[PDB]
Design a protein around this ligand. Structure first.
Ligand SMILES: [Co+2]
Ligand SMILES: [Co+2]
Ligand SMILES: [Co+2]
Ligand SMILES: [Co+2]
Lengths: 328, 328
């Protein structure tokens, strides 16, 4: 009976199935794929790449992704609808604002940003009628004044609609703690919030402190590792130096500590990427040729071999996304 | 025989007539009018406002404007084409980058930015086939590293196409001097470059130094004055404290010094403005209800009353734009 909005229209909650909760078709900037599609070879090439990659994920058991691209990540909801149809994978679109708002967003009040986020959830994105099913926000450590307005507008849009909030943060700066403080000052329930990029640290005091408070903890960059590429400074800065198995052990660490219901797993993958260095796709595709099938192909069996029960893994990959995405 | 690209297609140089060389339909951000047109009431309201204002300018004798909105000013070339048709005023569109490039532009090399600017001049903007007729760039004082790449890519696109380059600068910081240094290091002729916002200062050593070197000097913010509003800090910061008559005396100062062929006059007006404080249109429309008719209605007669000959004023408003816009 409960429903989630996707770029193809409403679906029953129970059909979302195995869901990757932090992904992107294309990491770009507002207006960019319309103005310069040849950056990606062509729009058609980008769409075909994305359809191949979603088909691969689907073969591996993924049924839904949440594309957390905001306005300022260059979200193109028509592209999402096209590739969702072609690949037969559900895609949930996002509203919110990430790190790159333009001036026309940076000048706005909390009330104005609230109406923008509500427009995209309740009315539709652009002129398409496609409704966002999640609100994405971002900080590093200490929230800037504008980021604090974004977080408050996200909380107010979530309270009005039931749609959840998901975050980018700097895990090494324990950024989720200030996010949580702002959301709670707005009366937002922690059960509506995922603190993302939490696998970028092994700081289990930070992670268990959020989980104990009821937050979802997004272990969402599973394939990110610059091991083997450490002379590529741009790769190292984005990916890192920890292995995927190190990241995946955090899923088991939280389950072992009683927090299985508080975990969301994903890749933070993409099929095009213009907001970083030229050719970064190419580096990424070498680190992780499986793309968005890496979680079911590598991470889930690794955890099953370490003794995590199948029921617990189904709860993390199916039940927890369903409860998070259901408007509540 | 010479031709200029407009948003309606090619026109003869000689039909551009009285031309305002630095204007905007809407000062916004990439993607913004598509994502949040209700910020402006509606897209239809914005277009109707712009058509009324261009009709008023046309009645006052304006035949062409150059809309120097770049990608990151939220240029919407379909909007420009619509309002140009409805108002029967030619509009030249721009490529280049202003102060608000997103990450997908800020990561690019000089070679990449060159191909983007060339795309918009030679192929067309977005999927529209509408060709830019000018390249807009921006700095304040000292160019940032990325701004220097923008200026070099603009110079290289101009050398390949003949299209001119026009600038935003901080006149109080004499920013045109560093712009000129970069353009000349690229081999760009000063005759292809307008150093804009030059009426924001009364520093005639700065202005005559550029004019002597062959630059066009853009006296382009004629109606900008916060006199009467000086308690509105945002108005003061953008407009200022000098009167329009003070700004217009710079046109006569340069003519009196022998630089009549080096002057371009405009308003830097707009019909919508989302990249600044909410309601700024409203403040602007009170300072200058004549909009883009203020130059022919107020500035030209003021100069004629101070004894500038009609032939000289025709040369500034017709001949100088034609020579500047003609690809050369
Ligand atoms: Co992120
Ligand atoms: Co992401
Ligand atoms: Co400017
Ligand atoms: Co301007």
């Amino acid at each position: 009976g409960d429903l989630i909005n996707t770029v193809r229209g409403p679906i029953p909650v129970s059909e979302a199935g195995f869901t990757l909760t932090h992904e992107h078709i294309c990491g770009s900037s507002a207006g960019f794929l319309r103005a310069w599609p040849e950056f990606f070879g062509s729009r058609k090439a980008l769409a075909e790449k994305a359809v191949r990659g979603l088909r691969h994920a689907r073969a591996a058991g993924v049924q839904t992704i949440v594309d957390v691209s905001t306005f300022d990540i260059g979200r193109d909801v028509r592209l999402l609808a096209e590739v969702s149809r072609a690949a037969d994978v559900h895609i949930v679109a996002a509203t919110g604002l990430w790190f790159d708002p333009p001036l026309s967003m940076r000048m706005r009040s909390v009330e104005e940003l609230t109406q923008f986020f509500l427009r995209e959830i309740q009315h539709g994105i652009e002129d398409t009628g496609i409704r966002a099913g999640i609100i994405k926000v971002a900080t590093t450590g200490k929230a800037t004044p504008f980021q604090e307005l974004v977080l408050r507008a996200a909380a107010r849009a979530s309270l009005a609609t039931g749609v959840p909030v998901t975050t980018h943060t700097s895990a090494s700066q324990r950024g989720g703690e200030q996010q949580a403080a702002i959301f709670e000052s707005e009366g937002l329930s922690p059960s509506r919030v995922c603190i993302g990029h939490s696998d970028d640290t092994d700081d289990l005091s930070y992670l268990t402190g959020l989980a104990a408070r009821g937050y979802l903890v997004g272990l969402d960059r599973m394939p990110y590792s610059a091991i083997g590429l450490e002379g590529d400074a741009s790769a190292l800065a984005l990916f890192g130096n920890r292995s995927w198995q190190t990241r995946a052990l955090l899923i088991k660490a939280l389950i072992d500590r009683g927090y299985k219901d508080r975990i969301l797993v994903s890749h933070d993958w993409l099929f095009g990427f213009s907001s970083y260095v030229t050719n970064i796709m190419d580096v990424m595709d070498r680190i992780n040729p499986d793309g968005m099938a890496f979680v079911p192909l590598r991470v889930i069996p690794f955890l099953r071999e370490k003794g995590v029960p199948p029921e617990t893994l189904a709860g993390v990959t199916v039940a927890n996304p369903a409860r998070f995405l259901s408007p509540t």
